[PDB]
Assembly symmetry: C2
Homo-oligomer: 207 residues x 2
């Protein structure tokens, strides 16, 4: 009974890998019909929370999603530096599995967004997706620093959801594009797993 439970690999706790330190153990999507996707098994002597709320102290709430941790979330530092990565999502070539390691927590009402993709590195073929926390206060943009990031999700055949994050203040004599097909915007990262596509907008010459 209760919430429909799926697994990123196989079809049961059995098929699941063991979690590394500070990894997401379960992903809860609460958009239409709430579902829980098991990522891994907690290294003992601990176990995965399954509450749909955030009261247990093991949950990171993020827009439309909840991420369950094995250890209490307060043991993680709060992020305060620029483009410190709140978490990284790694996907390996030969692995049927993906890991999401949390490095820090975004401050009150700061939303994560996909910012970078990069090769895992030496030994592993694959990619690493980087997420950061949106700025609490708005500063001046520098060259090559994006002022706007558009995240387009295909929710279904006939429903698209576009999140628009305003990152910094364009300098006098300049303005930031308002929609993602406008000029001064290029395609960023295309994380197909979540059916998302990112676009970055840069400060453009006025008029």
């Amino acid at each position: 009974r209760d919430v429909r439970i799926l697994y990123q690999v196989g079809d049961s706790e059995e098929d699941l890998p063991v979690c590394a330190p500070n990894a997401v153990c379960s992903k809860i999507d609460l958009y239409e019909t709430p579902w829980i996707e098991r990522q891994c098994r907690c290294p003992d002597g601990r176990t995965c929370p399954s509450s749909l709320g955030v009261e247990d102290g093991h949950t990171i709430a993020d827009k439309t999603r909840h991420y369950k941790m094995c250890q209490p979330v307060h043991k993680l530092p709060v992020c305060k530096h620029f483009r410190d990565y709140t978490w990284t999502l790694t996907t390996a070539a030969e692995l049927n599995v993906t890991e999401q390691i949390v490095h820090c927590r975004c401050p009150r009402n700061s939303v994560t967004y996909l910012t970078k993709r990069e090769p895992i590195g030496n030994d592993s073929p694959g990619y690493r997706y980087l997420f950061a926390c949106s700025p609490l206060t708005r500063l001046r943009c520098q060259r090559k620093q994006p002022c706007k990031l558009f995240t387009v999700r295909k929710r279904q055949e006939f429903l698209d959801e576009v999140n628009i994050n305003s990152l910094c203040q364009c300098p006098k004599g300049h303005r930031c594009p308002s929609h993602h097909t406008q000029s001064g915007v290029i395609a960023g990262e295309s994380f197909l797993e979540d059916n998302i596509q990112t676009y970055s907008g840069y400060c453009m010459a006025n008029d």
Copy 2:
């Protein structure tokens, strides 16, 4: 779990629900909160589970709506632009009422469509919501093809929901974004930070 009331600060200040009213609204975006709307006409109590298994819940995008009686007792909407529910907000009253008229078919999502007067002796409006199409029809001249719902999340974050309502006749294309010419301001709902825009079929190329 965070508990709010739309009037006063306790269960005592709440009025009683009329037939088929939403008794509690739950938002699950960011930090989950529950806003108590009204007290169920006994012998019943307003459900509080965050899930949709109790049979009293309608899930819609970011939100859950709780009802006193099970949801199956409500017909499933078939006609297009049958109003799934109406939100009424009065001038003198310290409270609002959402009456549910029918259920959208699976995965289909709701959107604000019209705003008509409550009329008569009490001032205020009635907001009308309809179900999103699960099949693509050919657009009849004059009917909007695209709906844009702009919701202001926080100071530096907007969320644009774009619904595709139907297929433009050949030799025409529906607009892609809300500032493009061929789109006008639809309805505003300040309470919920939304502004809708409707797109219509335009001259191709």
